[PDB]
Amino acid sequence: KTTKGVQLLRGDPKKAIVRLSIPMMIGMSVQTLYNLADGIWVSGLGPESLAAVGLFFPVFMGIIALAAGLGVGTSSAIARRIGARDKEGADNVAVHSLILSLILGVTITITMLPAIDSLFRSMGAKGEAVELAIEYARVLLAGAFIIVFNNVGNGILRGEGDANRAMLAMVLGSGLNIVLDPIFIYTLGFGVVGAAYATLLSMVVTSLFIAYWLFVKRDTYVDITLRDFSPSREILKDILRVGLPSSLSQLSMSIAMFFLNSVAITAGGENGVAVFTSAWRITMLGIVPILGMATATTSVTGAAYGERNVEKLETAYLYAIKIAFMIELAVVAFIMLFAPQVAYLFTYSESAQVIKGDLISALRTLPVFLVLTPFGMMTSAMFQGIGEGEKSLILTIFRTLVMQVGFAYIFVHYTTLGLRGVWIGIVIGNMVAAIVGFLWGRMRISALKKTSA
């Protein structure tokens, strides 16, 4: 009656952390490669097409944040039921979340469609860029329910230890999107709106395979039928308590990036942002693996929590920080050692602009934040795992909006540090947040020990 995923999920915590993290790293890497490739294809379309994507980008990220949020809340809730050997509960959560995906998906479409014109012109943007952005938006807003469905389906798979198929769904969608991208944009001559359709079709195909696994093969651990589903305010509250703050964390990180951009303006001007933009884009080499471990950390800590096994929860939590820290250590040492070569690609590539002198400096300072990220992110993943999303959000706000923005701001304004002060501030702010996160996580775990006793 038990699948390989569930065996893995409830087994040795260390094996579970590693083997559930790896597929997600691969899946997110392909997603990253798509994002990277699409940005290159769009940049060959001219200024108005680039602006159109820019107008819609925050809206798109808002949809993803909402979709991924519901997915994490789903994954966490299921993992805790499964850890508690409450299969009926796990089944009931799965059905609940799928219905919520439809509700949220349609809600996004109905709300955003009549509001995108006004929103896009609030930028002061006008002409073709706005009209292209509207046409681009209507394509993805139409498949809003597909986006949420795919994320929920992914959450269900992760939550029951099936990170393998969660990965496959991601590689399927993103992989097809990579292939379809230059075909729709250039070969078929659709232009920037072609990238919109390339994404949409890729998500539909992904949805078909997910729906096939969930409703036709029905070879998931959880049983998804319309008669184990007893409508539950409690389940709904459980999912939302992790889902909503998860989306709000994104917004928090979003607003923080905007503030850091303004700080970089004061520090080094318009090209100061260019150095900053290139800087954190590079660090994603390190962020991507940590994101993968966060998903596994959430499900493993959740499984241990439902099992009422605080020691196993503690072991998984601490082991995840340990492994992520070692992974980052290599990544950061690597980026530092080949900073002239990494900066080179971008900076040379556009021969007319040159900012390598500062990017190279930035690549010898900023990446250091990557070795302290695991402390905040595993703690956050663990909070999501035990179903306490508000704590995850509070930590994220403290790190991003208060510490990073605060330290970057102060160094630029009250010191000689200058543009380099932005990188120092972020690292120092991260250092303090890492300490707060780790102590809080361990504090929360140890309080559970007391409670179980």
Next chain:
Amino acid sequence: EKTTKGVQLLRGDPKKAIVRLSIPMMIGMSVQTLYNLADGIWVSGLGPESLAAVGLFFPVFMGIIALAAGLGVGTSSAIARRIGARDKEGADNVAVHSLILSLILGVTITITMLPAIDSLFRSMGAKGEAVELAIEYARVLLAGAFIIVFNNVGNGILRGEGDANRAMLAMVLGSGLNIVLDPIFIYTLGFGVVGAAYATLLSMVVTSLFIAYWLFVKRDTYVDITLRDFSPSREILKDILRVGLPSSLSQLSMSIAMFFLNSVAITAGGENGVAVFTSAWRITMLGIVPILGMATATTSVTGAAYGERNVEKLETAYLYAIKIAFMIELAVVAFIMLFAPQVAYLFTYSESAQVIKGDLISALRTLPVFLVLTPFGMMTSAMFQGIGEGEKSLILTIFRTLVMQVGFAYIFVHYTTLGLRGVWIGIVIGNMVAAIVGFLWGRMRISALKKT
């Protein structure tokens, strides 16, 4: 005896066989669809005359296929039944008879249609560059009619013994080669639209070389193919024609209805109504591909089960195919409807786009529903062919196209004022009736097979 994987499939679990014999056909057809799409792009770049020439020739091409595919299904179903009946000698005999028939039929098609193709096109189409090109295009493929019939018979033999994979391979190789040769003949060699006929013919010939090689040289099929001790049989010929002949007539019945349904849209949507449903027809030919795969699988499996005299196994296979086809079509139909305006755009890049586009969007939110009903009728028809009663399949086709669909579309136009919108409804309603009556007929036929 030394059997093959395909034979083991036919004699084993019907659900497994339905799946393993239907999927390869869809894949083969999907590559054919890729070829067709690419060819349409090259042809449309040659100008309106070349584009109109293809439209004029296309019914002639369908006429050859109707005869070729007809003999193929008659061949495949007969082989499948005798394999189920453990009648190896009969299976060998069907194969040899069909191969000889392919020569006779192919030659006869060329002999009779070639001198009558010049008079046929002009009497209804006057002239133009398009008329001249369409005639030249027809003469090329009419000349290679034997190759076309031989390929379908060879394909029929492969499917009939459960080797759908090699049938798929033959289809993929031919279309894949046609994909490469197509722009070479059209552009590089500067033959124009007629170049596409050369590329297709050459691809078909190469396909025949693979098939001939498998059947005559390597001879690694389950069936034995040899003229040694060959004895012509009326029983074998009747067994082939009782499915093969009505199969050809069914396609004739569909085309006769299509000529009517295209003119009903004239009284409904004007002359634009012609290109209106011609477009709709093209989209749905894409939509029915999985159904066609299910049907060919159904014929073989129900055929084998009939040969085994296992009615329960026959019934399982038949209902299971409907089950899968129904599920697949729901996904197809939802896609086509929920994402419809996009689909119409890819066929309407011409002047006065809106009326040809915007009507067909409406058709795309309504007409696709028929694909949901179709498997109940089509698997029934495929089951009729499987048991060797092709005339019942023909009767069902006539009732659907010539009676229900034309009848309903007619009355919707002549007695209602919905016009074009009613035409789609008329076809869908007529499709509903035929699917239910058909499924009911099949269910009674199976119930009778259990008696005596």
